[PDB]
Structures are given as C-alpha cells and as structure tokens.
Amino acid sequence: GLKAAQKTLFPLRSIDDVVRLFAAELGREEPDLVLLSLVLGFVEHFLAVNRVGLTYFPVADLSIIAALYARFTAQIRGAVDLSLYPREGGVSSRELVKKVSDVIWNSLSRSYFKDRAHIQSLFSFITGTKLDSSGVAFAVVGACQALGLRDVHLALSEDHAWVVFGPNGEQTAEVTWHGKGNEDRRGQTVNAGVAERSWLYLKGSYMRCDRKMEVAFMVCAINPSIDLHTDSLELLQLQQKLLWLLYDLGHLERYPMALGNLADLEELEPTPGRPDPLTLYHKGIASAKTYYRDEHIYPYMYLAGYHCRNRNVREALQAWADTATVIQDYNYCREDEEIYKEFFEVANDVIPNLLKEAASLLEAGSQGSALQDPECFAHLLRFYDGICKWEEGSPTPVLHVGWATFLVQSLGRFEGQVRQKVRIVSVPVLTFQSEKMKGMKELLVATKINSSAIKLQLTAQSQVQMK
C-alpha cells in the first residue's frame, strides 16, 4: 500500500514491536514483503551496520519506513509497465518476470562487493543500491508482489534462488546470479540444472515458497553480524523471535534450513518452553524427508555441526554419513562448489580435528569413544562411500589425492580391531554403494592401513611413481 492497517503499529520501538508487525503481516492474505524487508533492513542497519548513537533500539518511525517504501514502489511501478505484459489469467509471463529482474538488476550500483554483509534487504537496495545474489531474487519477488503478481514466488535451493510463476506456478525463471564468475542465466528455466541432477537445483526438490515462506526467507536472511567477532544480540533475538512466530504459524514446515537456523539460535540462547535444538534439527531433517524427497544436504549438516560443536563424534559422524547418503544420488556439477567445499572441509579438516581430539581423549582413558565404536567407523566409511558415489557419473570429479591422506589418517584413528568389526556386505553391517569403497573393503581392516593402496583406490590413480 501502504494500507492504513499496516501503519498502526508504528513507530516500532523494540524487537517485540517488530515481531508484532510481522505477526500482523503474517495474519494478512499476503504479508507485505517490501514493508517487512525494509523494516528488517532498517533495524539491521542501525543494529549491525552503524550503532552510533544506539541507546536501545533504532526506532522505526512510520515517516522513515513509508518514505523508503515509497521509494521502492515508485521505482518499481515507474520502471515496470504492466500494460506491456498482459497477464493471461492471474498468471505472470516470463517476459514480465524478466522485466522485473532487469529493473532490480539495473538499479544496483555498477561495482560493489557482492558478498558484503547486510546487503540482503530492500533497505540496502534503496539506501545503498546494493543487493547480494539471493537478495536480488527476493527483491524481484517483493517487486512482483508490489505489482500485484501473486503467482511470482521465490524458489530456493540450498545455494541459489530463482522464481516460480505462471500457470500452476509451474514455470521457473532465473532472476539473479549465482556464485562468482558463473555465466548468467537470468530468464532461463532451471530445467537443465534439474535434469543434470546437480545439488544446486536439488533434482527439482527445491523450495517453492508461498508468501509466508518468503517472509521466513527474509527472516533467515537477517544478518546479526557486527564484525567477525561480534553479533548484535538484538538482531539474534529478533531473528529468533521471528523464526518462532513463523514456526508457530506453520511456515517453517517446508523450510528445513530455517529449522536448522532456529535450532542454532536456540543452542546459543534457549527460549524457555521451546523444543531443544536437537528436536529442531531433526524436524529440519523430517521436513526435508517429507517435502523434498530427502534430497537436501544442509539439514544433516546442521545436525552434524551441532554434534560437532558439542564434540559428539558418534552423532556428528552419523549425521555427516547421512549427508553423504543424500549427496550420493547427485551428480557433482559446475556451480555445486559450495557443497563441495563443505564436504571437503568436513572430510579434511573437521573430522580430522574431531578424531585427533578423540584420539587424545582415548589415550587419556575415554570410554565409549567413537574410535572404539565400529558403528562410528561404519559412519566414516559411509560418509566416504556417499562422496565416492556422488562422484560416479558426475561431469566433474570430486576426489583427488588431497583427500587421500586425510582418509588414511582418519581410517587410522580407528584401531584394526575396531575396523574389523564392520562387516561390509554386498548387494555392525555396511553396504557400499560406490565402486571405490567396494574396492577398498579388503584394505579397511588391516592393522596398518595400506596408505598407498587406499590412495590408489580413492583416486583411481592408475600408477605409482616410475622410479
């Protein structure tokens, strides 16, 4: 609008006032994404970007927010002539979606750091003409809503955002960039990415947001970071309270990562009477299993990270093994690098450091250690098996020798008497899906792991050194 009913809670003088605004907007047929993103961006600006003069909460005066809102709607409605894009029957056209995307795109500063913090909201778009990659996609959806295009919705994978629109909301359109140095595909469908079974498009099991989930997205996009060492407690509390509002309304039901984020927030500062982080992590996994064919990686990464931070090696290993069991049915494609980096860091930094400490604790007499649990060895094996199976049929390889030394080291953290207890069964018991781990089976139980043979098997390296 802004409509009169949207204005009554102003001025927003507190976190709870912002929550009241979100509660009011979420009670409407269409929560106003532009209003809410401007409010979030405003409060984030004065709580994380510039806290000079902050004495409690940056009062969001209606005059300020309405002026920002007016700047956005004036820019969108001036630059997008809906008459050039007749809507068949409550359905938007690819050309109209492309136009809105172009309008947002062409509004941005010609040169800026695209990965900066706090450039995710419409406040950044208006006051700084800067948006990050997913912020452009959100702004396109917000602009489309402002234009009355009820069918245009945010589509979210775990690393990318686009829009769905059109008849039955069945059309997809790229509206922003992805990554760095990647070829722009704005205006195109995501069908090639779905067909190639990349993680980036989740084999089609990506989120198709309704407006409430788009509110959830902007809430998940709140960035409390003031600097590398300091988060705004105010923004953490705001994001946490808004996520609980969304949770209670059912709007995180189909948003696995939001449930992980909420679990993380609860671990940092538990809300009395709320589910434990673990319950929330498993709700995120349940959400992925229920709505997304169990084809999401981050629900298990969230869970694994929790167990890792609590130094719970067994459950961390189980969760990472579960992460790999999801990734195994993907093809590793160009633009999947973010999840490659995650698997790489887990295999080659996080697990080694966990097992290193576990080894020291085992030497100090720990009981029930993951290193003496063959099920934990099996988890480690299943983690690598899923990564190896992921690699099979992929257009780009996953493993290389830079993984092999960490594999040998991690395997060696388990004594042979533990490793021998895992029975690798063909099609603690473990079935390998990957041919690489199948060929590695006999090597996994030697008292002294054959490092060179493991390396050859993991990398499919043909030969050893000539001389």
């Binding site: 997913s134 775990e158 690393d159 955002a161 997205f217 996009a221 590398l228 990562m257 992980g260 990270g305």
Partner: peptide, 12 residues
C-alpha cells in the same frame, strides 16, 4: 565471515 546463502549453516 564468508557470505553464506541465507539460512546456510554457520561458517565455523
């Protein structure tokens, strides 16, 4: 911290 897609698990 390195830019994460929103709702990505935390960096470190």
């Amino acid at each position: 911290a390195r830019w994460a897609f929103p709702x990505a698990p935390a960096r470190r």
